[PDB]
Amino acid sequence: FDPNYPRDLIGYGRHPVQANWPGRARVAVQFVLNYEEGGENCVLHGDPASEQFLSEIVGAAAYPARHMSMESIYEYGSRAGVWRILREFDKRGLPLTVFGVGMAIERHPELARAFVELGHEIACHGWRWIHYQDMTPEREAEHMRLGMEAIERVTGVRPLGWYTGRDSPNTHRLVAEYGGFLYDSDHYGDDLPFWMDVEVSGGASVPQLIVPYTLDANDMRFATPQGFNTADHFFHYLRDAFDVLYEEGDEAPKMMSIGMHCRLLGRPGRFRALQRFLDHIERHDRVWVARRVEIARHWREHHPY
Template structure:
């Protein structure tokens, strides 16, 4: 087996071989990642009403758009269910299918009742194929004035999907989303994205933001087309997906404690500069009764704080576009060293 000299320089040297020039990457050379962000002294921001923290609940609606041989995929879904590390079946996986069906049949409506009864704004990350299979749920989202951001055509991993296929999926997702909801999506989140996802998204005008990033506690701008494009970072930590991962939450108490601690830290920091707290939910996960109580308790806790702004992502985007749109050029990466 060939040894990668950049990854295993000691082993490479033991063979009497010198390190290749490409192993010595100059850290001052152009780099496509932004490791600096706002830095030590971020610009001043404010939230509506002088609030300290924006608290944003996302309900991911994916059930019916996941991997399945019924959808033309090679195998069944293996991600984010009650099963730990399941195998993909080259046939229908009846148990996996029913775990997802719970989300659309029962879990969604439990979450819907909670948020509507408390009049809490919500953003839905809606997979268009999934939404097409449950028009009653889509209608309820609209009646509740929930934002429905586009979560792609399918809920699959796009990492190795050819660029032309992903481009066509994105085009169809936007068209289908508009037909299903009656409105063009203003936000986008693929989730399991590819190196091509954002550049493909920027081919479409009209998006106020995307959330395919986890890089900050605040929205930030990147270069997009002829102007600037807003990123509203999402979360994989204050997210019920950790109920389905080995290093995640074992019970609702852990989930509640983590959400509360996250809120407390950001709320305290918000006295000097406002922060954003995302909470990611899935109908088939947080919609289960044993986890649902933790979400109720967290809502009780948040609603005791007058300086918390409960909002939709599109509300954040509109606030940033109105007050903080950059009129200076925005770079994809940090300033380059000479």
């Protein structure tokens, strides 16, 4: 049936490959710090309208003007929220991967360099934090270029991972064509990395490593209609996810992503969720807390194409 169908619904099937994580880890835990603030929709950036998504104003209108509430909500993340998250990771000696938006990174260079100073990975989260669904591949390719160049120029580091989020039908192709990415995270389809065959211009295909991310174990759900009400909701969700995976780790260890946003989890009332979750996983043996790039390198070494 439908031999040419361009989606893999089967994956590993019933019995996934043995991850063989370092330290016989039962689960690999991968915290993602999104840094988008300064790169979002804003007429100041030449966008037609103000930002609507992932704010304290759930269901916000877009205006062909500056929306000040929305701007200072985003400014919280870069002014305050980010530092609160970074302090907590530093105090615990734990790494994370920053999904850095290029324009955001240029607007706050001292913070961007603090990320590198703290030893965190920076992956490229696009030049702009905007919806790419309808953008032509020529323009999207231009932004990819601007995004990587911005990050490298400011931090001295060349990202090795890509994640747009609100991507287009072309983004996987554009990542493969640009090349040099050890992983692409625009995928919610599994609990382990795997390889995708990405069709490129000409119709032929090229292997790309996918390191799947998450939209459910993600503080973005504080700003969506179905959405954690309190720190303890997000904490219990993470805790439960971790417990399920950790118990599976005797048979077939998996990975877990945790999605974080400066302007969201950085709020003091939500931040307790991170503290509680870290305390939880610290009680467990055989947990690898890894940079995303470390999981990609591990996969490429142990589970080559």
